[PDB]
Amino acid sequence: TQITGVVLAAGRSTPKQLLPYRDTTVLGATLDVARQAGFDQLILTLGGAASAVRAAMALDGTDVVVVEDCAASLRVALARVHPRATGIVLMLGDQPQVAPATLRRIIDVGPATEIMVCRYADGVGHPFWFSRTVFGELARLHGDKGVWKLVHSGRHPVRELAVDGCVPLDVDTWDDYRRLLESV
């Protein structure tokens, strides 16, 4: 069997993906973390900033999927998932603070669940695990924004992985980016 990681980075904003962070970029930092997790396959989704991202970073070893400018980038990423993968670990391109250890833990215990989320000190957060059994439902969401409602639904047995600290910062605004740079 296989485990595929999916990084969603198609979010509209200088592109937010290319903002400087820890000697690299925000997206570069996220991908650096994903590359350490031991995924058999890594899929990255990009939007309108695709060309800019490509020219700024080497995307070696990652399956790049491009959408137009939330968009339904998860739907098209699923099309790339290898047949022998029993599910996906889902990560967001603007959440570079995700710990490699958390990814290894969810890779370990995630496959014994239909859906798994991380339980932080201040609530539910990424990474998520989705079993192949829910790929159809994921594809039928209007956009990437619909995942949040799904992981809080009682329709599936959503399991929780306990993680120390609070939820990684989701870098959308300038205030978010300021908060990210502050913690070092």
Q: Binding-site residues, please?
A: 94, 170, 172
Closest approach of Cβ 51 to Mn ion, in Å?
A: 21
Closest approach of Cβ 92 to Mn ion, in Å?
A: 6
Reduced to 3 states, what is the DSSP secondary structure of residue 178? Answer: helix
Helical segments of the chain, H only = 26-34, 50-56, 73-78, 100-109, 135-139, 147-151, 174-182
Residue 16 or 85: the one with the smaller Cβ distance to Mn ion is 16
Q: Is 111 exposed, middle or buried (0-12, 13-18, 19+ CB in 10 A)?
A: middle
Residue 134 or 169: the one with the smaller Cβ distance to Mn ion is 169
Q: Which amino acid is residue 34, in one-letter code?
A: A
**Stretch binding Mn ion (CB under 5 A), from 62-70, 88-96, 125-133, 138-146:** 88-96
Residue 61 or 143: the one with the smaller Cβ distance to Mn ion is 143
Residue 160 or 172: the one with the smaller Cβ distance to Mn ion is 172
Q: How far apart are CA 90 and CA 76, in angstroms?
A: 14
Q: How far apart are CA 160 and CA 113, in angstroms?
A: 10
Binding residues for Mn(2+): 94, 170, 172
Closest approach of Cβ 121 to Mn ion, in Å?
A: 20
Q: Is 144 in the site for Mn ion (CB under 5 A)?
A: no
Q: Is 94 in the site for Mn ion (CB under 5 A)?
A: yes
Q: For Mn ion, which residue of 166, 172, 178, 179 counts as binding (CB under 5 A)?
A: 172
Q: For Mn ion, which residue of 32, 69, 137, 170 counts as binding (CB under 5 A)?
A: 170
Beta strands 41-46 and 63-66 are: parallel
CA dihedral 49, 51, 55, 57 (to 10 degrees): 50
Contacting positions for Mn ion (CB under 5 A):
94, 170, 172
